[PDB]
Amino acid sequence: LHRNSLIVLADVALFLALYHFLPFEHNVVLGISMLAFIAVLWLTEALHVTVTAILVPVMAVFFGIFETQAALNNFANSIIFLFLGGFALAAAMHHQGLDKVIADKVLAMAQGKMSVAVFMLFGVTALLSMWISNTATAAMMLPLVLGVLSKVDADKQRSTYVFVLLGVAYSASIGGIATLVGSPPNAIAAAEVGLSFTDWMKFGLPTAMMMLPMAIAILYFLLKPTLNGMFELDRAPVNWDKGKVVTLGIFGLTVFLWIFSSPINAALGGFKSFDTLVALGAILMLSFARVVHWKEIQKTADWGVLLLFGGGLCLSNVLKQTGTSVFLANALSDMVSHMGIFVVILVVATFVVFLTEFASNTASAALLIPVFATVAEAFGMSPVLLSVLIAVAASCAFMLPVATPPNAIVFASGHIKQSEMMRVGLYLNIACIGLLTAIAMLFWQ
Amino acid sequence: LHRNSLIVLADVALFLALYHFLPFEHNVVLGISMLAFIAVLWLTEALHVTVTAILVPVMAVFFGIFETQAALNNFANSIIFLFLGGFALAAAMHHQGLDKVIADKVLAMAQGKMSVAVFMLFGVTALLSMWISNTATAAMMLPLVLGVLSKVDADKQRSTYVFVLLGVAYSASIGGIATLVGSPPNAIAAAEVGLSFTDWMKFGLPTAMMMLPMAIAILYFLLKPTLNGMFELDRAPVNWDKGKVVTLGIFGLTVFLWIFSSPINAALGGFKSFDTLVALGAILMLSFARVVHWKEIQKTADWGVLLLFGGGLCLSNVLKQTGTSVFLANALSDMVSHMGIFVVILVVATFVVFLTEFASNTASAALLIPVFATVAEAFGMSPVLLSVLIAVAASCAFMLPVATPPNAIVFASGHIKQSEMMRVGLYLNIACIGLLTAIAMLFWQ
């Protein structure tokens, strides 16, 4: 007796209508009907996206596509455990106060001036969300801006809060674009096409360090904050201790292995998923050093996202087995030939941004990469390009906080203006699309 | 600089010593060394058992036994999602207050007399832990006994608390013996040998309904509580509401499918893991009815146990591939022939009970079933028998609460006597061993 339940029932009706009123082959029609069913559920949020991910194997099995174990085996792909290692590092830092220490040392780097402390905050948020996550990285940095701006006349000068708030909220999202960890869509792209950490970083890091300064510029030239005073916090300086240095060293070692995985993996025997093995080894070393415990890790890690990966992967395998992907590519050849690759990528990224406005970034990614990339497999036209393009565009979200939990946390202070944030996000969306397409045209050809 | 770290290093030393000072084949020596390594870690609790489970695939891969994905695929076995569905049902009941309602209706069944309310409490705990878990089932029932016994002179008459406390603590553990859900060891046994819900229930339910009355008798004839008065609670009677009835119907439907899975699965096409599919469908129906949400499920479900299943399964597959199991069975043939099956099962169950005293029940099970059952595979001598015997014995634990979280919760009231509980557990252990072996000799032959 709820709109969500009505959505599910109408969605079942659409599934049946497609099943019995489509003049295609049995496997392709089945896959298209499943894709529509799951698409509506993920976009409309009638059920939780994790629950829909759990539903994908069940309907896949009951239609005789996969065996139960084969369908469920996509919930233990190596990328899932890679993100698990990322969450473990996050738990270690939040448990040891290392993120607070990093912010305090940065803020000691800036003597007392706001005009650059915010910039170092954005940069630190990028470097930190690169390896961890977005929502976590926003939570601890919000109290900092409140303390810094507690003496700035918060009744007529609120754009300064808005700058030092949205810059962090978007810096985390852009920091997720440089490394596989930090943003679930990037993992999904790597999962479908097959990607190493270093190669994906060569594709992502330039985009991150070029997108982020642009976004900061957009805000600064749109809204005009002061950034001319001085701040003098009253809080005490936290200093180094055992555990903090050890987990810092483990973090550096893990990054070093993830970067030089190809030579190391070649020397050690050439294992298939050395990045994931490094993630698990990081968990083992943290447990060995007793810097964190599994209950912290269990409380911190979002297992719903890890199951949503399984949903996306099972959907991709379903579309691959059923032939829907090649059927779609063959039907879309005429459109992709008439319209150049330039306009093709413009419409794809534009559609992604308008899609995550009224949807979840990760759910939309898990819906989209299996379609276009498998389509791009048949086309030729390296699907790594489209996969990363969609994955990065998913992280670029600048809409009403219901779209994005980071925006929810940062909005929750309760003084930011709805319409102003919409217009700011509009300009940011436009700039991201243009810059992304320029990168793909010039660098990736 | 901790005893746990010293244990890990000495454990590495034992691994290397076995590697280079054992005159067996390379694969069998490798598997034995891994088994010793993991055994010590799980028993000594140097690291968390979940962390050790994560370690098993890493060392398996780095020694060239499995590919990374093949090793990790044991973390998504269908049994794991079966237990996930159990946790989802638990979340629904704790969210809707249904367990409180069940206890209140039972306590309305008993007008005001303690002499049978405790017995219905033990029985309800059995029927409830059959489908859910142990620790959860203990938590809500402890306040009940406090309220009932708040007027019983808790300075000289404490054995009444002890009866109404340990009976529940052990009723949950025994309730886990009748169904696959409720106790992780039973899932591990089903996983290795291959077992359906109904068949395992034919093996387990008689044992549960025969073990539980015996245990209650042991306590009643050892310690003498009064159970002759009347209680008059002051709390209000909670009544039925929407959601409670719906999740009750879903629980009944899920049980009905799990029982009549074989005919239904035969009719529907004969799917491989219809029990797991029923579990997932239960999650879907709960989400569809909006009686529970994924954040309740995520907070409730213990993902460490689900990963520990993957550790046990990967260890079993490692021992199977390496030939350690058949090597062990061939070396132990002379002992198993000289000593009859009767004495073999007596020593096995006796060793299990003395093992879980200073260890975790589930970790010990994940250590033991892969050894004996795969050994029993080669012997003949149906390994279902040994697997279930070890799995049920693991649930039978009556030792210091550090062994068992249910005992931790029930002890935490702080008036129970250490030595008395040890002696009570000793007699209970003895009776469980004897009765279990009688069942295996007579019924299972």
Numbering used by the authors:
A (entry chain B), B (entry chain A): 18 to 462
Please, what does the article write about this entry?
Unlike the VcINDY map in 300 mM Na+ for which 3D classification converged to a single map, the VcINDY-choline dataset yielded four distinct classes at a resolution range of 3.6—4.4 Å resolution. Whereas the overall fold of the protein in Ch+ remains the same, Na+ densities within the Na1 and Na2 clamshells are totally absent. While the VcINDY Ci-apo state overall structure is similar to those in the 300 mM Na+ (r.m.s.d of 0.672 Å), the model exhibited significant changes near the Na1 and N2 sites. The tip of HPin and the L10a-b loop have moved away from the Na1 and Na2 sites, respectively, with the carbonyls of Ala376 and Ala420, and the side chain of Asn378 also rotated away from the Na2 site. Notably, HPinb near the Na1 site and TM10b near the Na2 site and their connecting loops showed marked decreased density in the cryo-EM map, corresponding to the increased flexibility of these regions. Instead of converging to one structure, the simulated annealing resulted in an ensemble of structures, with the greatest variations occurring in the HPinb and TM10b regions. As the 3.23 Å apo map imposes C2 symmetry on one of four classes of particles in ChCl, and all four classes are different, the degree of flexibility of these helices in the Ci-apo state is likely to be even greater. Such helix flexibility results from the absence of Na+ interactions with residues in the clamshells and with the dipoles of HPinb and TM10b.
VcINDY is a Na+-dependent dicarboxylate transporter that imports TCA cycle intermediates across the inner membrane of Vibrio cholerae. Substrate transport of VcINDY is driven by the inwardly-directed Na+ gradient, with dicarboxylate import coupled to the co-transport of three sodium ions.
